[model samples]
Target: ANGQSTRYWDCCKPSCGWRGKGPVNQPVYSCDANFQRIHDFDAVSGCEGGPAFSCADHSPWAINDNLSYGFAATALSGQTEESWCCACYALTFTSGPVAGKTMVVQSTSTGGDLGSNHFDLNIPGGGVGLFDGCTPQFGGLPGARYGGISSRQECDSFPEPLKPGCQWRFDWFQNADNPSFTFERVQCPEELVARTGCRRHDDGGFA
Candidate 1:
């Protein structure tokens, strides 16, 4: 499926962090303020004064200059949380400086604010969107509420664990602004599964 891509780092616990959101081996892993995994799926979001927050390990990383691996809050046309959660999509960039780059992202979340086939890539310095869990997790972040930091140097102010991914936006990503992509469902990568702990029973086949 073709899709529009955006970026965010709301730091809120992903919607799919709850059990029953999908037919997967487990829900996406969430972390506490200290970035330690919180085993209980029912833990409330730190943004809501609870223990759960988006895990730092979910951050995007470069596989090479042309390919990357990441997680996103995805909303595909004709799909629901049950179909989206834990699903992976190979997104081949179709616009901007990243036109030929491919980013394989696992769907760890969904958002009401997203439109059809929207994949909101989770980058460290990429805006706070609708939540502010970063404040609780790292005291605060240095960026706008929507478009995020303006320069690569701003990434230095992010938490230690997040700096690399933030820097990736400037490096491998070439600072592309909301590049569009053509996406297709794919089996989740072992690297992504290792971090999220989610795998669909019907992975690699279309539902």
Candidate 2:
């Protein structure tokens, strides 16, 4: 809530064109290896061997195979990747068509920290609701190139558990200058907390 935010997705898998390499702008990818080009509640069900559906039963991080819900990564310092991997958040857009709609942060950003108080959110994952355009608008704003109207709002972990089969449809582009979004941190749902095994603090900090 005190800083800026952006969008990101699980496009770094071997099946993806990005393959975890190249630039972040105007990116391209393939839907191979149980992956899908479309967003659906059961998308993860079809995927195998990817971060969403790892062969390892006890994942180094927490993630849902369905990919039904949106995912995100953080840049806060002093927190281990394991502490936040697959952490879920309740994001409420204050503007755009889906102004009141709330989505969950189910994934993390690539290469660890995105920067303190920053989030590289997933496109189509949540952008559909806030989506306005993919090309830059208004003097090269991040929203123009990112597609959708990026706005500031309240973001936090869900007080309740993430409802099963949660998901959204979306897409991504390799645009320079990551789109900036703003949100507040909310308490995460119990289910995700257990999944991440993130330690909680008395002062509302996760470790």
- Please list the C-alpha lDDT of all candidates, in the order they appear: 0.88, 0.33
Model 2: residues with Cα > 4 Å off, grouped in runs: 14-32, 36-69, 95-97, 110-114, 124-207
* Tens digit per residue, CA lDDT, model 2, 1-207: 533445432223211122222222211222322333322212231123232321111112214322223445455555554344444455554444334444455333333354565555554222222222211111111223333333321112211111111122221122213434345445555544343333233215432
Q: Summarize candidate 1's per-residue lDDT along 19-61 as a digit string, tens digits.
A: 9999988899999887899999999988898889988899999
Which residue pairs in model 1 clash with each other?
A: none
TM-score of every prediction relative to native? 0.96, 0.37
Give the 10-residue window scoring lowest on summed lDDT in candidate 1. 111-120
Top candidate on TM-score is: 1
Candidate number of the best lDDT: 1
Error of 1 at 40 (Å): 1.1
